[PDB]
Amino acid sequence: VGSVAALLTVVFYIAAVMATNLYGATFPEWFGDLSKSLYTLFQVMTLESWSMGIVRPVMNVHPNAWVFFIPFIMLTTFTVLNLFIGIIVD
Amino acid sequence: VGSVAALLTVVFYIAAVMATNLYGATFPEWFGDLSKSLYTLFQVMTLESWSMGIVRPVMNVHPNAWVFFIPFIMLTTFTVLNLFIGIIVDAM
Amino acid sequence: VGSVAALLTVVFYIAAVMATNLYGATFPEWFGDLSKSLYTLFQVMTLESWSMGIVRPVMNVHPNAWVFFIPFIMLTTFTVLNLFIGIIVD
Amino acid sequence: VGSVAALLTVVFYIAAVMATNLYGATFPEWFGDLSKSLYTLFQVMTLESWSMGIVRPVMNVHPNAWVFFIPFIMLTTFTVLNLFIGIIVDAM
Ligand code: NA
Numbered sequence: 001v002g003s004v005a006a007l008l009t010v011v012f013y014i015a016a017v018m019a020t021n022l023y024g025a026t027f028p029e030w031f032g033d034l035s036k037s038l039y040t041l042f043q044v045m046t047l048e049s050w051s052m053g054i055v056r057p058v059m060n061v062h063p064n065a066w067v068f069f070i071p072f073i074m075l076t077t078f079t080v081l082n083l084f085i086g087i088i089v090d
Numbered sequence: 091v092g093s094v095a096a097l098l099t100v101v102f103y104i105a106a107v108m109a110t111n112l113y114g115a116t117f118p119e120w121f122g123d124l125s126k127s128l129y130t131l132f133q134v135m136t137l138e139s140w141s142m143g144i145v146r147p148v149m150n151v152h153p154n155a156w157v158f159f160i161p162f163i164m165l166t167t168f169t170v171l172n173l174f175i176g177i178i179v180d181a182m
Numbered sequence: 183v184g185s186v187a188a189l190l191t192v193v194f195y196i197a198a199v200m201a202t203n204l205y206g207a208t209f210p211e212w213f214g215d216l217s218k219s220l221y222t223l224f225q226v227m228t229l230e231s232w233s234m235g236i237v238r239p240v241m242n243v244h245p246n247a248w249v250f251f252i253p254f255i256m257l258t259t260f261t262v263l264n265l266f267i268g269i270i271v272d
Numbered sequence: 273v274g275s276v277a278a279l280l281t282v283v284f285y286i287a288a289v290m291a292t293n294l295y296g297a298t299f300p301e302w303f304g305d306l307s308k309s310l311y312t313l314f315q316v317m318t319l320e321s322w323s324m325g326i327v328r329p330v331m332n333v334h335p336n337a338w339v340f341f342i343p344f345i346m347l348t349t350f351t352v353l354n355l356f357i358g359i360i361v362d363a364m
Pocket residue numbers: 046047048137138228229230318319320
């Protein structure tokens with residue numbers, strides 16, 4: 001549980017630095033700075049408007065952006081599910 | 091299960107009083123009164139339009155509002171998941 | 183599993199008859215007929231746009247409509263979760 | 273776990289070929305090619321905007337499209353849930 005929760009903040013800082021870098025100058029509202037990018041990656045993590053709201057407009061500028069966003073989900077939405085199950089078991 | 095379900099209504103009254111207070115006069119549609127604030131915090135709890143719909147417009151007036159909304163989710167969306175698992179366990 | 187799956191179709195016919203009746207003439211796009219009402223109650227069941235999309239516009243005409251929609255969710259989104267767990271166990 | 277993960281990519285190729293075929297010429301933005309159709313079926317799989325965003329506009333042209341989209345969900349959103357549970361079990 002402890003080793004998993006730490007890995008999640010590490011993955012969330014590496015993606016939040018990257019999302020600010022790649023889609024910063026192009027999408028300043030959602031990917032302006034690290035904090036802006038953290039808040040928006042979390043929105044994508046809870047699945048809220050992930051595709052139609054953020055993931056789709058970004059592809060219209062950066063067509064390959066799905067390589068960033070789809071794997072992040074297949075990871076973060078698995079991790080959190082595994083982490084929460086770990087809490088109940090322990 | 092009983093001790094958890096009661097804690098959920100307590101957390102939902104403390105946040106519903108707070109959400110009406112902080113974002114009331116500024117966002118009367120979603121945070122006008124306790125009932126309005128209860129219904130909207132629940133929308134945030136089920137994750138439905140949470141960010142793009144409510145959480146984002148509120149930050150454009152109250153930039154720190156994320157300190158209220160992100161923790162509420164990391165709590166209420168964990169509690170309900172743990173509560174529902176508790177029901178199934180206390181049956182088998 | 184069998185006794186639960188049958189209860190779900192029964193609850194989905196009683197609500198689909200009711201939703202067509204209450205919010206029919208007022209909201210014909212989403213609650214016109216039984217089938218229209220079934221499809222829309224399912225959208226509410228998967229939580230997709232449930233509040234901002236359907237539940238909110240309906241309250242602006244029928245203020246108490248939340249008494250119909252919130253309990254339906256606390257039931258159908260629990261039932262399906264319990265049913266799917268039952269399949270994996272059996 | 274291995275036999276389930278392979279079945280998921282097989283179901284996702286059979287639907288992605290079909291979605292491109294049926295709703296291609298009519299909905300080129302979301303169902304233009306196999307890749308476009310894969311990405312959009314996945315959006316439907318995670319439930320994100322599934323109904324109000326994609327499933328509803330498509331029915332206004334193809335009224336029976338719900339026969340394609342509702343079963344896909346009752347399958348893919350069950351499979352992934354069962355697959356993820358299989359991973360946790362094959363670890364403890
Ligand atoms: Na969701």
